[PDB]
Amino acid sequence: XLLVTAGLVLA
């Protein structure tokens, strides 16, 4: 989808 991580990058 539209998300911003350090670690588990998502849909």
Residue 10 corresponds to which tokens in the numbers above?
A: 């998502």
Q: State how far the Cα of 11 lies from the Cα of 6, in Å rounded to an integer.
A: 14
Residues 6+ apart with CB under 8 A from 1: 10, 11
The percent of the chain in helix, strand and coil, each rounded to the nearest 5, is: 0, 0, 100
Contact 3, 10 (CB under 8 A): yes
Specify the experimental method: NMR
